[PDB]
Design a protein around this ligand. Sequence first.
Ligand code: DTP
Ligand SMILES: OC[C@H]1O[C@@](CO)(O[C@H]2O[C@H](CO)[C@@H](O)[C@H](O)[C@H]2O)[C@@H](O)[C@@H]1O
Ligand code: MG
Ligand code: MG
Lengths: 555, 412
Amino acid sequence: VPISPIETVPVKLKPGMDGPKVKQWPLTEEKIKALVEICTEMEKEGKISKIGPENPYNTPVFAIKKKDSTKWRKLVDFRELNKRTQDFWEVQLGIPHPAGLKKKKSVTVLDVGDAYFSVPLDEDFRKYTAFTIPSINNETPGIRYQYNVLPMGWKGSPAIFQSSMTKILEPFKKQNPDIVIYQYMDDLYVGSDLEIGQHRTKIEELRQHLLRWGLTTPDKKHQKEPPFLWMGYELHPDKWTVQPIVLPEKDSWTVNDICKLVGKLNWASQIYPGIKVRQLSKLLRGTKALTEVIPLTEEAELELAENREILKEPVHGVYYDPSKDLIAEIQKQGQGQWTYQIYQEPFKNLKTGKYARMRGAHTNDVKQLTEAVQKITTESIVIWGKTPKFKLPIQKETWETWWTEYWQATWIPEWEFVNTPPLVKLWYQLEKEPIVGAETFYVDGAANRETKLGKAGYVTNKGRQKVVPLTNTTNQKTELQAIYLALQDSGLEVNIVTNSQYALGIIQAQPDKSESELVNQIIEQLIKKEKVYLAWVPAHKGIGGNEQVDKLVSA
Amino acid sequence: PIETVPVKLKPGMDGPKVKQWPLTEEKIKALVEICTEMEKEGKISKIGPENPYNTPVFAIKKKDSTKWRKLVDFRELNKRTQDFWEVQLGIPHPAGLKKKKSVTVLDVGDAYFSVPLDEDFRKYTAFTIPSINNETPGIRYQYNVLPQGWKGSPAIFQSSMTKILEPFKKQNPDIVIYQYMDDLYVGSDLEIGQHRTKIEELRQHLLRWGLTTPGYELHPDKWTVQPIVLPEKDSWTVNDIQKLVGKLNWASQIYPGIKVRQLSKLLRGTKALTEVIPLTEEAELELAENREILKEPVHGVYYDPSKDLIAEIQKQGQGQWTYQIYQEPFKNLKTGKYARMRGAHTNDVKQLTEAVQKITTESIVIWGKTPKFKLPIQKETWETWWTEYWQATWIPEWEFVNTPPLVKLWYQ
DNA sequence: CAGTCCCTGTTCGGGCGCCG
DNA sequence: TGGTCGGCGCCCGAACAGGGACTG
Ligand SMILES: Nc1ncnc2c1ncn2[C@H]1C[C@H](O)[C@@H](COP(=O)(O)OP(=O)(O)OP(=O)(O)O)O1
Ligand SMILES: OC[C@H]1O[C@@](CO)(O[C@H]2O[C@H](CO)[C@@H](O)[C@H](O)[C@H]2O)[C@@H](O)[C@@H]1O
Ligand SMILES: [Mg+2]
Ligand SMILES: [Mg+2]
């Protein structure tokens, strides 16, 4: 008979499914030594129990060395058991950010000893754990073992531990309403405005409370003294920063190289302002082998150069003062790249970040700024539960012109203009009404679905006409082409009549950037005009100019 | 000690698993206070990760309320119970409700907390409360009684509800009463003072039964429609007639009697857009006849109770929004316009949120259903802000469209 | 009156970074 | 040796949805 410590969580298998069976790994003898000592130790505690072959379940096992330690970590591959185990609802809804933390007079960071192994597994479910122990030779069989406690590598371990930990914690928290406990897995962050002696009294008293349920906090990983190490950050009394990031130095970069690099630079950009990954990511698009070597363009190299130089100087963020306002400032970095700073006192940042996402085939800077504002707002609500005031490099009238005229609902929360260039503006404006005395170009284009051959042309009230043959095109592409022709061949003011809804939809959203080079050229011309009026008529209605140009391009 | 009506999901269908979205500090504080009293009262109790189901939760303030109200987004659960309410216990819809000079809406959701909930069903009402900066993991709950905003709560409570209603219904036999979700719609043709007075008497009836009531006053007879309208001009430019022909051509998908031939005749050449074109007598009459046809009703448009309602909205600008409700394309059961709503000339999302609310309400009153909205907004924009402006206890279904306006058919 | 083809936009799972 | 679990973030590409225009 074993013993029971804290309330368990019922865990059924998925219905009509049975426990895991799969043979063990060819484990090297060097690894085999580590497990045998630990597994025997567990049985004395009651974490593990021996099973007679009446238990017909086998699942592989392995182990990895604990990082920054001599100890080894003991992992049971449960991939097939996960597949057949009931689904849970994860209770870990995100990661705590240091910029969320308020300033605390006294802070303690303490870790739980053997976190998953102190939490009882479900009694009925215990049978499915079974795994076969290994020996130095293949002669000695090795004992069969069933966990009595949560095991690493199960898909139910994190949620059960987090839910169990919160239940244990809650009574203490109710007792001490003014203590802050950040609970992330087994790592506990405890902060109070109590003076250091009184704070340690609560800290030890909290240690007693966890002990009652069999949770042990060793002194070995108890941090009485700053700077604390927490969630990959270094915490100081008034400031914080990321734990140092090493960027590989390789002279020749593979594909896997750039991925690690990129992923580090994204981690860095939460505090280091102005990190840019655009050109480094350009190297990863449409590549086959993770192993493949790839040369760096002079763009990804220059980028990487200024990225490394930003890391040269140490930077730090501060903590959150609920009394003062939250402020987000955004700068345009070019090529659909945006960075932002969130702060309360000028030049003392809580955190930074970047928004580089290219959304849409045709877009403009105003749309991208709106996207970045939304990403910042959601991020802020997670960390602080409120929306920052915004400082934006866009004139109040530019924004007013965009949002009032756009056909989609769009909005930015409370914000003010900051005059830091490059300012965001609309490059061109379509006229609301036809331009008096400007030439009217009726434009159309057509193309043959089979040949991919087509014509683009215009007719005008002055009698000007053009038709151009095109090869390897589409109806859509020729309708754009027709418009491009009218813009090229017209004066500074022009009325254009198209029946292409496709083209009219692209152009009316005032794009300044496109994946299509043809649209970029249309943009180029629109910017050079003084006045453009675009109008739409239905095709095949025998209307005016449109009918005549329709005949020309159809031919 | 009451029998719990057993409840089942639609066949071959699994419970809702929907991630909780981030909440503001005020909403999290409001929910934590609401839930804690609810747990102590036994309405909800804490649960654990074994329950694989989750539905999103947040809080709202009703119009002028100033008091936080817990709102659960049960849209996914409700669709998975969709057969249960419609097939078996659905409330009938009083076609007379829309005709009443005044209709008041009451929040009777609190009553549902009386009746308990099938022990086997409670696993599907699971909702997680988030923490600021993820200080704590999610605090999960589930419902022990009939949850507000679920579609089973009015249906199961209907047997209890009618008995409480029955005295008042007999004392005022011409007052129409309808139940949609957490709300009670009470219409009458009385004068304003009598109406509000009669409303209090209904509140007392609920009070003696022990249900607290915290109401919106509608006027469905005031409600009007927004027909398609053709401009009125002294002179007509080529552009003017081009705009007119395209509008009419699109309108002909709705009223098949529209003719453009005599108006197209004016456009024969290749002319400058600003050139003035006198209208011929034949075009004047063709344009006259069309203006009449657009006053007329469309042929064979009627509501089909089996089909879903679809609502489309267009942003006309300057605080003006147009909508159409339909079931089949081009057969519109109602078309309308809103103007000078809250947030006009400053906030598009607030205005769109208001419009969605107004349209849904109209559809409840008229057809007893909520439509599926096609929203003229980017998905990321709507999801960021909509909960900030939501003042209603239901949540319709929506999707997101981007259709730029080739023609201003609905609004001049 | 279907059936395609364009073209666009969304979703989802893969890799990596980071936390236990 | 190569190998487990959950969470969040980015950037990618592929697979899927759907809306117009045009083809018979
Ligand atoms: N690489 C991993 N794979 C699976 N589970 C992990 C892994 N790393 C951490 N965990 C889980 C299991 C641990 O019980 C829990 C806490 O991690 P951790 O504290 O580093 O180990 P530990 O608490 O069991 O030993 P110790 O207390 O000595 O550090 O999170
Ligand atoms: O807005 C779409 C978005 O909402 C979610 C969660 O809120 O789904 C909900 O809304 C849908 C649209 O009305 C419903 O169909 C769905 O049942 C409901 O969960 C997300 O799933 C979705 O991405
Ligand atoms: Mg530990
Ligand atoms: Mg054409």
